[PDB]
Design a protein around this ligand. Sequence first.
Ligand SMILES: CC(C)c1cccc2c(-c3ccc(CNC(=O)[C@@H](N)CO)c(F)c3)c(C(=O)O)[nH]c12
Ligand SMILES: [Zn+2]
Ligand SMILES: [Zn+2]
Length: 232
Amino acid sequence: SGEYPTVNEIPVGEVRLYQIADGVWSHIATQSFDGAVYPSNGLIVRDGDELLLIDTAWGAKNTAALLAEIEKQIGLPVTRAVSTHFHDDRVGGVDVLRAAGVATYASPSTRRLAEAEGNEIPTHSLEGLSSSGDAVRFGPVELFYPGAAHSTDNLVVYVPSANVLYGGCAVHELSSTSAGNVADADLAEWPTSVERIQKHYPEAEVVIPGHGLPGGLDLLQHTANVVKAHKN
Ligand SMILES: CC(C)c1cccc2c(-c3ccc(CNC(=O)[C@@H](N)CO)c(F)c3)c(C(=O)O)[nH]c12
Ligand SMILES: [Zn+2]
Ligand SMILES: [Zn+2]
């Protein structure tokens, strides 16, 4: 009823959308992994009379439900998708997207890591993102590679028309007490990568984490704090 959705308000197998700004939505789904249930976010950005999708809904069936929810709530076609790193919460569902006519994209690093993990593999490679601080335009967004953080390949996404920063899994929500799933992380570099984000996007108004609730710019400093306290 208007609050940000949580696992407790998403019916089983289902996806919810949340309006962030004009022409910007997040998508929220839930999935089980190793016997626990987690929410995850992605982004939808209006691209004229088409939509750009950022990240899958963490699984094939979730991603099919995402497409249905978009059709119901927005009614514009998803034409392109970008995955912001190689984990299944970002790429699981790419095969569904690819068979639904969506062109799927990720950095070459993400594609290599996805293939090596046995995860679904986006079709198209995004060049120009291999060095930290790199940025490229992609439709209505800017893609930015901040350096290694949650993963070596993690990308963030900025929507300049709305000053929305989608941090993905490199950014955690304010209520977080832990650095999440750090199996593939670089805890030592992560603060430096967050400082790069902070320097590059000082006018961000909304910051969206990979998992949990959006907030403001404070999510960035909080993230650095939680990662430092974890590493210690
Ligand atoms: C590899 C990928 C598919 C994956 C699988 C499973 C979990 C995760 C998470 C994750 C884990 C924990 C928390 C917060 N803690 C809790 O939710 C407590 N209930 C338990 O510690 C969180 F915010 C995110 C992340 C991430 O960090 O990006 N990626 C995950
Ligand atoms: Zn991840
Ligand atoms: Zn994640």
